Design an enzyme around this catalytic site. Structure first.
Site, short mmCIF file in Angstrom:
data_model
loop_
_atom_site.label_atom_id
_atom_site.label_comp_id
_atom_site.label_asym_id
_atom_site.label_seq_id
_atom_site.Cartn_x
_atom_site.Cartn_y
_atom_site.Cartn_z
NE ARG A 119 50.10 -44.75 13.34
CZ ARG A 119 51.19 -43.99 13.33
NH1 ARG A 119 52.39 -44.54 13.31
NH2 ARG A 119 51.06 -42.66 13.35
CE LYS A 178 48.90 -42.39 8.87
NZ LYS A 178 47.51 -42.48 9.29
NE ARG A 227 49.01 -44.52 17.12
CZ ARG A 227 50.27 -44.09 17.10
NH1 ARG A 227 51.22 -44.73 17.80
NH2 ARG A 227 50.61 -43.02 16.40
CG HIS A 240 50.62 -38.80 16.79
ND1 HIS A 240 49.59 -39.71 16.94
CD2 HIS A 240 50.72 -38.15 17.98
CE1 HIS A 240 49.09 -39.61 18.16
NE2 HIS A 240 49.76 -38.68 18.82
CE1 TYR A 299 46.22 -40.71 16.81
CE2 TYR A 299 45.61 -42.68 18.01
CZ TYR A 299 46.13 -42.10 16.89
OH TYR A 299 46.51 -42.87 15.99
#
Length: 314
Positions: free
Chosen positions: A130, A167, A223, A265, A274
């Site tokens: 990110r 994150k 991303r 993730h 996504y």
DNA sequence: TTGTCGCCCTT
DNA sequence: TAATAAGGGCGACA
């Protein structure tokens, strides 16, 4: 879009809850269809009919960190998701230019902004990390691409490991082998003799925004693309390797797991925020697995791009 | 003369 | 689970 103030199931025009709105006000239609989460304070509900709430912002309130949190209708979210198709196709069409920019600049001076961006762009297209806004490094200790420091770069005589906490306190490890085209330029950029310094010490949020602007995308789009591309690579490999074959239902599930782990993730988040909806819909079709099987990955990537392009009616 | 910051929107 | 956290993008501000 007049702001209305919420307090205990009823609506006011007033900051401190004197002066209630009209009983027939359209906003009460909305309150029949959504539940204000009780952990919020200073809740604003926007005066509109349910049918219009569906399409945009509905209400906003402060959580316990004091942050303003924003709640959207189901149609707003649907449009949001529908955009991933076009982003996937958009990035795909600029990759050639991105690489071109990368390879022009990675033979440049160590403290050249353009060299630093080149490396930045190559780490991004390689690992999908990110953006890494300064803000979250100060507030939460979160590191992303821009906020990487030399301590996050471990040098071995045959590999470089990039290790950092991103994150949600999720711990990431990426590895760059000698043969990788990122090795040489990354080893050259990082200074062992000052670990507390930023890797991209000649860049900044503003520099990155200006630079990416030329490809007409945003770093987060790289991303989104990376997740779809990795999904496709894994899907293609899975179809190509796995004993006879499972159901498309379970084949998608596996591919999503593999992809989610690479990216770092949850599978749920990967599918939901996504993956291009059309890809998800396209790959369900059993007859389509025949098609995949007889292709090189490149001709597969192309078939998918084309179908997404034109099912998007553009 | 540029590094925060708020607001909106995304994950 | 069921309750609800913390990222990015863009432009204004001094």
């Amino acid at each position: 879009m007049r702001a209305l103030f919420y307090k205990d199931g009823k609506l006011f025009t007033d900051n401190n809850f004197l002066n209630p709105v009209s009983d027939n006000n359209p906003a009460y239609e909305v309150l029949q269809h959504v539940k204000i989460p009780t952990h919020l304070t200073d809740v604003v509900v926007y005066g509109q009919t349910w049918e219009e709430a569906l399409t945009r912002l509905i209400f906003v309130g402060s959580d316990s960190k004091g942050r303003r949190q924003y709640f959207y209708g189901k149609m707003h979210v649907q449009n949001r998701n529908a955009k991933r198709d076009r982003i996937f196709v958009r990035v795909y069409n600029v990759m050639k230019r991105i690489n071109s920019f990368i390879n022009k600049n990675i033979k440049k001076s160590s403290t050249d902004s353009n060299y630093q961006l080149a490396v930045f762009m190559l780490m991004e297209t390689m690992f999908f990390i990110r953006f890494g806004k300064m803000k979250y490094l100060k507030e939460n200790e979160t590191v992303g691409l821009l906020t990487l420091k030399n301590k996050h770069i471990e040098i071995s005589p045959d590999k470089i490991v990039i290790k950092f906490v991103g994150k949600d306190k999720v711990s990431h490890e990426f590895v760059v082998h000698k043969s990788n085209r990122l090795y040489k330029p990354l080893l050259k950029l990082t200074d062992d003799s000052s670990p507390e310094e930023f890797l991209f010490n000649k860049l900044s949020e503003r520099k990155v925004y200006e630079s990416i602007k030329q490809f007409g995308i945003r770093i987060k789009d790289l991303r989104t693309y990376g997740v779809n591309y990795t999904f496709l690579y894994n899907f293609w490999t899975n179809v190509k390797s796995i004993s006879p074959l499972p159901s498309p239902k379970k084949l998608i599930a596996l591919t999503i797991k593999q992809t989610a782990e690479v990216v770092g993730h949850t599978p749920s988040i990967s599918k939901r925020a996504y993956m291009a909806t059309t890809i998800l819909e396209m790959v369900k079709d059993k007859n389509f697995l025949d098609v995949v099987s007889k292709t090189t990955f490149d001709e597969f990537l192309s078939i998918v791009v084309d179908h997404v392009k034109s099912s998007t009616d553009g």
